[PDB]
Design a protein around this ligand. Structure first.
Ligand code: ATP
Ligand code: ADP
Ligand code: MG
Ligand code: MG
Lengths: 68, 55, 470, 512, 48
């Protein structure tokens, strides 16, 4: 004879099921929201010392090469 | 051919373990009886002492 | 020269027959001829030069007529920095096997509480690193703190966390008095403080004192070993105006030990079998643990709730003496939330809009009202469910669970059990994190991320990480 | 050693026998009733000292009063009469200890009741001795395998802790103890002294017919060679039931102080409190709440606090205690159960509902807890034990929604089914202990979700067939899990691939 | 549906009230036994 436990389990059970589906929607909504200078100077100074022609495209690639 | 070779191979070890295990158990089992005979002999000595007291 | 002599020995109660100059009550008597030092505390004068005392050690081996020496003063224990970082016995003997204890002098364990005119009460927030505590039940430096918990609820581990967070980096000294608890926990704490460098063998270090009255000790010793630890804190308080951190283990064992012998002492049992002097006996200890003009003592004492029955006389009387209260609930542990601090039952004398900032007080009540409303909805939700509720009620239940789950904080002492490294939360980040949730900052993200997190930012980053993972 | 050499040493030993007698004070009994004897005179007598009556039965002087002395009869008090003689022995109560204790059945005092022969022992230790300090102890870091899946996985027991087997009558309290003794038998046969665990069974207030059946089971499985049974039946006087727990505890301290490991099992302590209450009430002492003495808490605390894990400096020995408590109607709020729970480390709650619903061992994992936690479990166990608890936690919640019904999400159906496999998996029959490595394999398959395929009623039989299949074909895998005690990645891949494969090979009910 | 639901709640609420009243009687009976048990303990201790 324990009715308090019955109500307690029913509370946690339905809440978990209800919020379990809400978690899916929350993950999808936040997931959909997530889906949508100094290094340039360092390389440029090096190219200056060798007095070689430098272009922003080359510097951008070298900068991207450093991060890669 | 590889399943037969591995079968006889592992089966050969199992037989080897069977013999050595048998040869070891028979030895330990005999030692157990040997200790029992020794205890029985000495137990008689204690039994003789107790009977002497009664007399 | 021994004046008294053993006349009656029953259990832990021992009577001494004196010829003349009876010793005052509470005096310490030394029995001669015992394999171990036995001390007897005078408690009652029965007349005819008879005195009834309680034995601190096992009475087995005693003999009627054994000479007893009168010291003329109550049980005196060594005080001073020599006790820092060393385990001591109820009678002052070192049980750590590190040698004798050096003390500049010996003070008695019995003294009158400080007067009211020189009380010098003060309120100062104590950042313990626990967000649930620093928000709902703030602690006051120099005021009593109570940890009400049942059998196996997490109060022992919580004390260890407070030590790891509060005891260390403390200019003043600290005292740890463990009475009535199991001895296994004592060995663990000693090794823990040693590894954590809280205590060390090198002199001039180990700014922390340890006192143990574990179960292995017989009755009477567990009821007075608590006074031994207090005397150490009193020395560091009066002689030096330094803030002392007194970490008292479960104190219910003190009042319980008194009842274990109250029957043999002649007292009539109370409604629940306790001694009639429970209020006075407990009051004498609480009144002594207080801040004064000389120094201040921030006492962290735990109260064991037997059978989870808060109506017991022992804890019920303790609430009146405590400044900050921390009632542990067993329901939270079933859900996995730790620390299982009851937000509604837990209260703090510092929880006043005038004492603390109005924003801190506002966020505190906002969480309490939110949880209180959610608890009422449990009834209707059990039959109809959250779906049948209105949008207003749905949001209340949604945020209430997220806030309730967010209260869970993993600490360093819980790593072995959970496996997640501890974390420290500041008061500013604590108030800001919950204040943002109350406004609905985290209502969008799932409630799963608001579990065992330190700050709100940590929960959001974890939520985004799970998104890219799938 | 030759027979002649041993006989000469035997004769020489009998020659060197000393016997000294000194003047021993004696007193007369003022009154005798209900086993309590009031003795006149007999001064200079120590508390708890042993005294002998005219018939020859012993006594313990507990109450030392200025007028008389209160003595308890350690046996049948029919022959005692007014004015009889009472001789003080001069030594506190003690019992024989040693290795010869294993394989016999003794009483509270330590006398063997098996009838085989006299006890050949020379070491006697005091029954009541101060427990170890704080330094001699050591952190518990060794697992005490009981052979039960739920226990070894959810409530791990480490050598040196104190676990409480609390439950109602006929709830499987003794079954748990028996399964543990049977499990340790294997480690005793193999030459692994680091895992041998001497078992001590203390019977307090139990019918002799039941104890007789208990001993036969041990001999049936050959597990009595390392078991010690202390018997304090109901007909036995209350002091015997009061000292039997401490008596058996002293026998355990022998192995503890000698760097060995011993397991002591205290039967229902409520029966001890009745005997201790009876012994105290008859002494005219003031009773406490529920008629029990005031220091009843100190009784069990002093007893259980001795069990500890000694440090390496003293030999590294350990003593594990498994006290039992019988509840009237599952009410743990009573006085005695509440105290024992606060003294022990962990407690195993037995539910009568779970028992009749087919959940045997009927263990309520929701309330059961252990201080040592995963610190005792092996590497291969901690990893799988962690996820097991979480999965079972969710299942207990969705139990109510099953009644609600009318819909079920895909995931909830899986979690609901998955949890059902674990509950059906943790079930175990009586007198059927399982090896630690075997449990890892079965428990592993459950958490991974492989058991969700076959029908629940077939999971129990799959356990037997699966383990047997592994023991024969995959023997090296079991050896690694045992020796190393860790579940390596190579074993994970191999185990993860054979578990689904085996289910498809054998003839089972695959429809979920 | 609403008609049958209303009747169901009426019968359910009726049974809920009857059971609640029955337990109230047992609660009072248990209260008296509690006072008797504790009272005898206090008298037993005061006797000696
Ligand atoms: N796990 C089990 N599986 C199958 N049968 C069981 C199991 N446990 C107990 N039984 C049966 O329950 C009866 C004995 O119960 P058990 O002795 O284990 O509980 P108990 O609490 O120790 O009883 P008591 O208090 O009288 O000593 C026997 O009929 C036994 O077959
Ligand atoms: N917040 C918590 N952190 C870590 N472990 C906990 C926590 N709460 C409970 N435990 C569990 O509680 C049990 C220990 O209880 P404990 O703290 O020792 O109570 P007590 O203070 O009375 O000794 C352990 O089994 C442990 O698994
Ligand atoms: Mg504790
Ligand atoms: Mg039983």
């Amino acid at each position: 004879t324990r009715e308090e436990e019955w109500l307690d389990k029913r509370t946690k059970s339905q809440e978990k099921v209800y919020f379990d589906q809400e978690d899916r929607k929350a993950m999808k909504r936040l997931l959909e929201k997530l889906n949508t200078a100094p290094q340039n100077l360092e390389v440029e100074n090096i190219l200056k010392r060798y007095h070689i022609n430098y272009t922003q495209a080359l510097i951008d690639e070298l900068v991207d090469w450093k991060t890669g | 051919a590889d399943s037969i070779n591995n079968f006889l191979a592992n089966e050969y070890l199992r037989l080897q373990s069977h013999i050595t295990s048998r040869a070891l158990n028979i030895l330990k089992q005999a030692q157990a009886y040997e200790t029992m005979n020794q205890a029985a002999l000495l137990q008689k000595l204690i039994d003789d002492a107790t009977s002497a007291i009664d007399n | 020269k021994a004046n008294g002599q053993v006349s009656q020995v029953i259990g832990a109660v021992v009577d001494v027959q004196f010829e003349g100059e009876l010793p005052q009550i509470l005096n310490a008597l030394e029995v001669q001829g015992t394999q171990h030092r036995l001390v007897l505390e005078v408690a009652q004068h029965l007349g005819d030069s008879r005195v009834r005392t309680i034995a601190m050690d096992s009475t087995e081996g005693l003999v009627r007529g054994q000479p007893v020496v009168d010291t003329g003063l109550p049980i005196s224990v060594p005080v001073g920095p020599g006790t820092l970082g060393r385990i001591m016995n109820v009678i002052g003997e070192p049980i750590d096997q590190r040698g004798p204890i050096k003390a500049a002098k010996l003070y008695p364990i019995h003294r009158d509480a400080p007067s009211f005119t020189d009380q010098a009460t003060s309120a100062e927030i104590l950042v313990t690193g626990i967000k649930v505590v620093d928000l709902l039940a703030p602690y006051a430096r120099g005021g009593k703190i109570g940890l009400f918990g049942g059998a196996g609820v997490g109060k022992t581990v919580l004390i260890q966390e407070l030590i790891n967070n509060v005891a260390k980096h403390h200019g003043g000294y600290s005292v740890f008095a463990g009475v009535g608890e199991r001895t296994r926990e004592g060995n663990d704490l000693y090794h823990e403080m040693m590894d954590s460098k809280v205590i060390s063998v090198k002199e001039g270090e180990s700014r922390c004192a340890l006192i143990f009255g574990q179960m292995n000790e017989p009755p009477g010793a567990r009821a007075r070993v608590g006074l031994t630890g207090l005397t150490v804190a009193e020395y560091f308080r009066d002689e030096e105006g330094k803030d002392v951190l007194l970490f008292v283990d479960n104190i219910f064992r003190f009042t319980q030990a008194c009842s274990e012998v109250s029957a043999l002492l002649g007292r009539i049992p109370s409604a629940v079998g306790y001694q009639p002097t429970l209020a006075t006996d407990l009051g004498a200890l609480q009144e002594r643990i207080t801040t004064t003009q000389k120094g201040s003592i921030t006492s962290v004492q735990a109260i064991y709730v037997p059978a989870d029955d808060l109506t017991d006389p022992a804890p019920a009387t303790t609430f009146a003496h405590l400044d900050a209260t921390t009632v542990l609930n067993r329901g939270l542990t079933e859900l996995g939330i730790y620390p299982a601090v009851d937000p509604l039952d837990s209260t703090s004398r510092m929880l006043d809009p005038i004492t603390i900032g109005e924003e801190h007080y506002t966020v505190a009540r906002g969480v309490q009202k939110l949880l209180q409303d959610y608890k009422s909805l449990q009834d209707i939700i059990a039959i109809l469910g959250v779906d049948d509720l209105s949008e207003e009620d749905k949001l209340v239940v949604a945020r209430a669970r997220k806030v309730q789950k967010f209260l869970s904080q993993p600490f360093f002492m819980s790593e072995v059990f959970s496996g997640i490294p501890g974390r420290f939360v500041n008061l500013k980040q604590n108030i800001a994190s919950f204040k943002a949730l109350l406004e609905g900052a985290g209502d969008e993200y799932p409630e799963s991320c608001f579990y065992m997190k330190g700050d709100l930012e940590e929960s959001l980053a974890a939520g985004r990480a799970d998104a890219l993972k799938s | 050693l030759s027979t002649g050499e041993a006989s000469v040493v035997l004769a020489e030993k009998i020659k060197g026998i000393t016997q000294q007698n000194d003047i021993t004070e004696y007193g007369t009994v003022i009154s005798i009733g209900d086993g309590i004897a009031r003795v006149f005179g007999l001064t200079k007598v120590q508390a708890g000292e042993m005294v002998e009556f005219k018939s020859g039965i012993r006594g313990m002087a507990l109450n030392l009063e200025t007028d008389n002395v209160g003595v308890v009869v350690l046996g049948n008090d029919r022959d005692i009469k007014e004015g009889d003689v009472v001789k003080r022995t001069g030594a506190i109560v003690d019992v024989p200890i040693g290795e010869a204790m294993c394989g016999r059945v003794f009483d509270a005092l330590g006398n063997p009741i098996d009838g085989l022969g006299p006890l050949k022992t020379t070491q006697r230790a005091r029954v009541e001795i101060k427990a170890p300090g704080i330094i001699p102890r050591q952190s518990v870091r060794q697992p005490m395998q009981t052979g039960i899946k739920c226990v070894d996985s959810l409530v791990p027991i480490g050598r040196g802790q104190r676990e409480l087997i609390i439950g109602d009558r006929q709830t499987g309290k003794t079954a748990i103890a028996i399964d543990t003794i049977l499990n340790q038998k294997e480690a005793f046969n193999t030459g692994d002294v680091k895992k041998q665990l001497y078992c001590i069974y203390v019977a307090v207030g139990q019918k002799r017919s039941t104890i007789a059946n208990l001993v036969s089971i041990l001999k049936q499985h050959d597990c009595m060679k390392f078991t010690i049974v202390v018997c304090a039946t109901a007909s036995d006087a209350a002091p015997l039931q009061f000292l039997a727990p401490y008596s058996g505890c002293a026998i355990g301290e022998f192995f503890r102080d000698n760097g060995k490991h011993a397991l002591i099992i205290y039967d229902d302590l409520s029966k001890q409190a009745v005997a201790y209450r009876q012994m105290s009430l008859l002494l005219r002492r003031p009773p406490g709440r529920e008629a029990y003495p005031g220091d009843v808490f100190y009784l069990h605390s002093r007893l259980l606090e001795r069990a500890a894990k000694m440090n390496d400096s003293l030999g590294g020995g350990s003593l594990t205690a498994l006290p039992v408590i019988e509840t009237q109607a599952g009410d743990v709020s009573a006085y005695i159960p509440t105290n024992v729970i606060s003294i022990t480390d962990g407690q195993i709650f037995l539910e009568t509902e779970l028992f009749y619903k087919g959940i045997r061992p009927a263990i309520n994992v929701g309330l059961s807890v252990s201080r040592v936690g995963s610190a005792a479990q092996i590497k291969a166990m901690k990893k799988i034990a962690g996820n097991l608890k979480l999965t079972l936690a969710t299942y207990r919640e969705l139990a109510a929604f099953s009644q609600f019904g009318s819909d079920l999400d895909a995931k909830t159906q899986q979690q609901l089914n998955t949890g059902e496999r674990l509950v059906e998996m943790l079930k175990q029959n009586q007198y059927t202990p399982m090896k630690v490595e075997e449990q890892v394999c079965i428990i592993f398959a459950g958490v991974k979700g492989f058991l969700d395929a076959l029908v629940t009623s077939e999971v129990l039989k799959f356990e037997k067939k699966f383990l047997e299949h592994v023991r024969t074909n995959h023997s090296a895998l079991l050896k690694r899990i045992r020796d190393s005690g860790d579940l390596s990645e190579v074993d994970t891949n191999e185990l993860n691939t054979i578990i689904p494969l085996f289910i498809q090979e054998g003839g089972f009910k695959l429809k979920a | 549906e609403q008609a049958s639901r209303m009747n169901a709640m009426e019968n359910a609420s009726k049974n809920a009230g009857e059971i609640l009243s029955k337990l109230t009687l047992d609660y009072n009976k248990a209260r008296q036994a509690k006072i008797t048990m504790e009272l005898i303990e206090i008298i037993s201790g005061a006797s000696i």
